[PDB]
PDB file of C-alpha atoms and ligand atoms in Angstrom:
ATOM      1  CA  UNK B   1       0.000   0.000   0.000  1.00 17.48           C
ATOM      2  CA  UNK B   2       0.945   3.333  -0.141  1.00 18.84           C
ATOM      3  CA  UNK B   3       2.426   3.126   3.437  1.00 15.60           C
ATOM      4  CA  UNK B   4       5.035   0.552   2.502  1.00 14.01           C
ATOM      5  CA  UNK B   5       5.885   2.479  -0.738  1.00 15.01           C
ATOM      6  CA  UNK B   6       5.981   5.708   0.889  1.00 13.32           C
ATOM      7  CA  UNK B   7       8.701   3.840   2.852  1.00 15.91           C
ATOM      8  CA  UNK B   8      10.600   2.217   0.615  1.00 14.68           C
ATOM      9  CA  UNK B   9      11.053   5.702  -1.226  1.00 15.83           C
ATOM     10  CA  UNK B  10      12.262   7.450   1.881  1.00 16.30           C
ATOM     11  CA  UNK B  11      14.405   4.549   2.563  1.00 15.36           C
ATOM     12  CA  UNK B  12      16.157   4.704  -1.517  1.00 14.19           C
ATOM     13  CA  UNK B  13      15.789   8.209  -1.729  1.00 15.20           C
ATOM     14  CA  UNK B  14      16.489  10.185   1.322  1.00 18.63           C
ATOM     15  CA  UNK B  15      13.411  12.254   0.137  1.00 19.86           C
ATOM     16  CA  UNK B  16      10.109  12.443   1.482  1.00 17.88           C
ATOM     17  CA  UNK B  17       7.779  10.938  -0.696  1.00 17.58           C
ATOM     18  CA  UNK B  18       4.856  13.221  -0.299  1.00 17.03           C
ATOM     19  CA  UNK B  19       6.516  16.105  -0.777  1.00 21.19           C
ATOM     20  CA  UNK B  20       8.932  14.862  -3.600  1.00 24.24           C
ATOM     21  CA  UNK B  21       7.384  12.897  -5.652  1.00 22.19           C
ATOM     22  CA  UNK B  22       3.781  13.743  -4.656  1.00 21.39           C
ATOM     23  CA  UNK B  23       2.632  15.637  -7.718  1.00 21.83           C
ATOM     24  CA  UNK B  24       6.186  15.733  -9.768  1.00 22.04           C
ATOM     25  CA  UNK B  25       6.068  15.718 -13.894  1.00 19.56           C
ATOM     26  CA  UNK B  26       3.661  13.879 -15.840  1.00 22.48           C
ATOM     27  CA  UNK B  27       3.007  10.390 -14.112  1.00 25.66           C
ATOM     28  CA  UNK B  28       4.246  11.054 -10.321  1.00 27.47           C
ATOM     29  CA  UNK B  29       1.869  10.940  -7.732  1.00 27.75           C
ATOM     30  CA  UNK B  30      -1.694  12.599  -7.820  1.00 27.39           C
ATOM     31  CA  UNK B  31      -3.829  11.996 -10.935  1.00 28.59           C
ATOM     32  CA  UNK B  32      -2.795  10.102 -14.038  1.00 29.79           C
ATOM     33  CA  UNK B  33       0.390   9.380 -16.993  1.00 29.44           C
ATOM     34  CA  UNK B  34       1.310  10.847 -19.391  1.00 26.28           C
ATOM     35  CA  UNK B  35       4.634  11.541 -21.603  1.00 28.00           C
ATOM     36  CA  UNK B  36       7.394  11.812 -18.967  1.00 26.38           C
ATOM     37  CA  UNK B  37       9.684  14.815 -19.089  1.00 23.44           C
ATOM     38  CA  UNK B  38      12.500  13.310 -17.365  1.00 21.48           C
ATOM     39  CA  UNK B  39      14.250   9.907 -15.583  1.00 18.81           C
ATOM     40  CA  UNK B  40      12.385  10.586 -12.547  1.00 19.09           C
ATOM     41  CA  UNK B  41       9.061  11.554 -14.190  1.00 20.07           C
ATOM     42  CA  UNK B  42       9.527   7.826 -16.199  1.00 22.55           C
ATOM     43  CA  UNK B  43      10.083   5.727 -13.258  1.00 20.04           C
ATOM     44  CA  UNK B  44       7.024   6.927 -11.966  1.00 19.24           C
ATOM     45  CA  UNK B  45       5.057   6.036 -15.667  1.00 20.57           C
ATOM     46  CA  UNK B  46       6.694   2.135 -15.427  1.00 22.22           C
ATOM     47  CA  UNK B  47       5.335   1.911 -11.768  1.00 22.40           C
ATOM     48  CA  UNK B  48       1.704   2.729 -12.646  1.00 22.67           C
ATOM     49  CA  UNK B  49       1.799   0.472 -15.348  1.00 25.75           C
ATOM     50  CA  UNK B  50       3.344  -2.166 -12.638  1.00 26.79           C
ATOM     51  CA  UNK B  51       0.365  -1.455 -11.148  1.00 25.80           C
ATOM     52  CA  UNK B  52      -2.064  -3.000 -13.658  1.00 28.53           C
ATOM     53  CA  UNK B  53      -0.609  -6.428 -13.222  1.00 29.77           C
ATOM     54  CA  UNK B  54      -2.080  -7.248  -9.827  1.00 29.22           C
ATOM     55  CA  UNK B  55      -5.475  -8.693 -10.520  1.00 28.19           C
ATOM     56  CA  UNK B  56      -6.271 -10.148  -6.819  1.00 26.19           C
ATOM     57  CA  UNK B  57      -4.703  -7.593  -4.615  1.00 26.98           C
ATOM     58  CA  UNK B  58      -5.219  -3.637  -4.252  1.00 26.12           C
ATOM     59  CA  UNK B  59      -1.946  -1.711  -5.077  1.00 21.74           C
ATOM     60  CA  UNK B  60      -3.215   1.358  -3.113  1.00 21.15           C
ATOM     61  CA  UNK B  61      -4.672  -0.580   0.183  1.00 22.24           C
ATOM     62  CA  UNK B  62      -3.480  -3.755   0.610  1.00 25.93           C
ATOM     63  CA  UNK B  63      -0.104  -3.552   3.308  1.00 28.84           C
ATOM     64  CA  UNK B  64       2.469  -6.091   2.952  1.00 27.21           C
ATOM     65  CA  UNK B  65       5.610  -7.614   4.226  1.00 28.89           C
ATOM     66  CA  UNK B  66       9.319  -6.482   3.514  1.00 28.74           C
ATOM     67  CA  UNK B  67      12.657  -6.199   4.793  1.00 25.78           C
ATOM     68  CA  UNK B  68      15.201  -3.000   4.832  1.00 26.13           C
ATOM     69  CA  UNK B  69      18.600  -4.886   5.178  1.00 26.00           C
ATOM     70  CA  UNK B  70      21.364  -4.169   3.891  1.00 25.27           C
ATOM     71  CA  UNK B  71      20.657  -0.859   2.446  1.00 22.26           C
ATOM     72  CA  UNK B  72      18.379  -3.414   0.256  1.00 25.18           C
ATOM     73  CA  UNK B  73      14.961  -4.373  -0.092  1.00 21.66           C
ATOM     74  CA  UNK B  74      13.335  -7.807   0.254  1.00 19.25           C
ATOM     75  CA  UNK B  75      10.257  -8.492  -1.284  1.00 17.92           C
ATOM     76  CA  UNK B  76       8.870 -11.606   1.327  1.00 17.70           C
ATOM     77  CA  UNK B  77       5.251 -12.176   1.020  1.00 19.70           C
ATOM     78  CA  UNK B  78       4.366 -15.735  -0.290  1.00 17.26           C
ATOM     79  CA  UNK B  79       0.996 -14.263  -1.866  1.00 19.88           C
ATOM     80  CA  UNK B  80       2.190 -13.732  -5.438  1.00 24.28           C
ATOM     81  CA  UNK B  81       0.124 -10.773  -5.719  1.00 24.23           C
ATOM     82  CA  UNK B  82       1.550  -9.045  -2.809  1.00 26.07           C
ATOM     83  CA  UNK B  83       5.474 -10.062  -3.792  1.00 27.59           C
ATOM     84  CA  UNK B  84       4.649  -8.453  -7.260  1.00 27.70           C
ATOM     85  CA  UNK B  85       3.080  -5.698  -5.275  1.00 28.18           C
ATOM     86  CA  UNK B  86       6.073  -5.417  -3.317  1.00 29.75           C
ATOM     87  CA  UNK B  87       8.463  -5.856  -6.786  1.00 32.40           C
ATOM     88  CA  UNK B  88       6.402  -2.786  -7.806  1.00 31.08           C
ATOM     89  CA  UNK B  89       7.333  -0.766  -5.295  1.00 27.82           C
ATOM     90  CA  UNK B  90      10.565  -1.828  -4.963  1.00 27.42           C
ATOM     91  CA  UNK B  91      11.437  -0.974  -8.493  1.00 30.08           C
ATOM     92  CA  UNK B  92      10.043   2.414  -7.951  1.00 29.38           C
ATOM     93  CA  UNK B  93      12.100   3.574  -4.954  1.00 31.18           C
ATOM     94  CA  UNK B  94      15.717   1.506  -6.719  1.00 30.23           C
ATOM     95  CA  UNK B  95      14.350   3.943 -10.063  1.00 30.58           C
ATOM     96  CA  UNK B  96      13.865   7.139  -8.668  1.00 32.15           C
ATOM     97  CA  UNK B  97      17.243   6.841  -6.419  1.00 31.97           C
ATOM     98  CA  UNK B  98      19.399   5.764  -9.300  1.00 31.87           C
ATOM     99  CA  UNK B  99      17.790   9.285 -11.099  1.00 31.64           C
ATOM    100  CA  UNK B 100      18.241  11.669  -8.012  1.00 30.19           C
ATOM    101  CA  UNK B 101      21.281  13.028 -10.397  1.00 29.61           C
ATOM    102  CA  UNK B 102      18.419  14.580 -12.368  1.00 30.02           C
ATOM    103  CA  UNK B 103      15.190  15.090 -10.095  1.00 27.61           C
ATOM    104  CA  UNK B 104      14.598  18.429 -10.863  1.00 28.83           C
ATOM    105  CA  UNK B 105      13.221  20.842  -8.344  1.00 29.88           C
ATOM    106  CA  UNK B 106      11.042  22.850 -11.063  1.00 26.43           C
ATOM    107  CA  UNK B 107       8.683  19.439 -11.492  1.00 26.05           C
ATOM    108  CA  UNK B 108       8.385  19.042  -8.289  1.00 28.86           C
ATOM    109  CA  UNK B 109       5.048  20.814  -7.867  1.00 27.61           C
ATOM    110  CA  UNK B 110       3.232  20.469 -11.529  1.00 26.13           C
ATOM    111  CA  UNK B 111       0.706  22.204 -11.964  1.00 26.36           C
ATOM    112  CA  UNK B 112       1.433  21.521 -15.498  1.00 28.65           C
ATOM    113  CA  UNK B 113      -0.719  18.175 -15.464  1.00 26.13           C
ATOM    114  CA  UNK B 114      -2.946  19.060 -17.277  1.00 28.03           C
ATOM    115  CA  UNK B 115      -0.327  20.227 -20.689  1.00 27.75           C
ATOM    116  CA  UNK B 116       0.883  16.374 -20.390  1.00 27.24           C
ATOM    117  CA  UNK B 117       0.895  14.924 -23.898  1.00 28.69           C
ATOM    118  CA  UNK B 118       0.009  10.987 -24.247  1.00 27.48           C
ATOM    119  CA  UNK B 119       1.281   8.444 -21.814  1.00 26.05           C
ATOM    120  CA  UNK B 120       3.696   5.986 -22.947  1.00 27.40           C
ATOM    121  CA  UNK B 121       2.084   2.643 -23.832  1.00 26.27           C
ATOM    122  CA  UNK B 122       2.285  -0.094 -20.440  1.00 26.91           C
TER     123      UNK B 122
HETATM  124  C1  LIG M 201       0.866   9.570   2.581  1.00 27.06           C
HETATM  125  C2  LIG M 201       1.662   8.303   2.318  1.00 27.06           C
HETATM  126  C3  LIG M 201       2.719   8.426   1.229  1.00 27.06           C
HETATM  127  C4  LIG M 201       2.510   7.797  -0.158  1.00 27.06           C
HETATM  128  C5  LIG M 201       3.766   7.772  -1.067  1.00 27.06           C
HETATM  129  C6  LIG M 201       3.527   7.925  -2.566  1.00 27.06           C
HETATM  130  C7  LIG M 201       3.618   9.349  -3.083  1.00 27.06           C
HETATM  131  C8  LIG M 201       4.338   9.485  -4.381  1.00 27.06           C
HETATM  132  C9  LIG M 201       4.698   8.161  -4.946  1.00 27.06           C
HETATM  133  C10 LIG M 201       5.043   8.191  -6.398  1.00 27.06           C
HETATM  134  C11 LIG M 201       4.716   6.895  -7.074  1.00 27.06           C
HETATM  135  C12 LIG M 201       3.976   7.020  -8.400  1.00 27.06           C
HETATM  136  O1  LIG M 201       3.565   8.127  -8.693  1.00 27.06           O
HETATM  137  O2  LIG M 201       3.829   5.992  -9.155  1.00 27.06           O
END
């Protein structure tokens, strides 16, 4: 749920999620996709996508299991549609540290939604 991927994000990141990520470019956070404008913006169009694969489980509700060792994540649910959940999640927070070289603070609050051309295809 969005607890444990809140976490996981402050855990890669450094960054609060909320404020970070919350509404950054196209596909982060509140509302929708659409084209990316950067790294950051595109990690955040994969993991909604990610999203559509879990049939039985709720990506925004349903909590899960994981472990923070090792400056790693462990995805250890035995529910296959909670470990994918999980995999989600964790691909989001390893994508959006390994593009903190290029988060850029003018995205951070977009109001520009709206001027998003097409999402990428899932
Ligand atoms: C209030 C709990 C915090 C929720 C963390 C998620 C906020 C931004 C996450 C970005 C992920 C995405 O947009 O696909």
């Amino acid at each position: 749920s969005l607890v444990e991927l809140g976490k996981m994000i402050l855990q890669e990141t450094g960054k609060n999620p909320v404020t970070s990520y919350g509404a950054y470019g196209c596909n982060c956070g509140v509302l929708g996709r659409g084209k990316p404008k950067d790294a950051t913006d595109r990690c955040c169009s994969v993991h909604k996508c990610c999203y559509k694969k879990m049939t039985g489980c709720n990506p925004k509700k349903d909590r899960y299991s994981y472990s923070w060792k090792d400056k790693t994540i462990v995805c250890d649910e035995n529910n296959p549609c909670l470990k994918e959940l999980c995999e989600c999640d964790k691909a989001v927070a390893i994508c959006l540290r390994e593009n903190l070289d290029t988060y850029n603070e003018k995205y951070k609050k977009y109001y520009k939604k709206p001027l998003c051309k097409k999402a990428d295809p899932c």
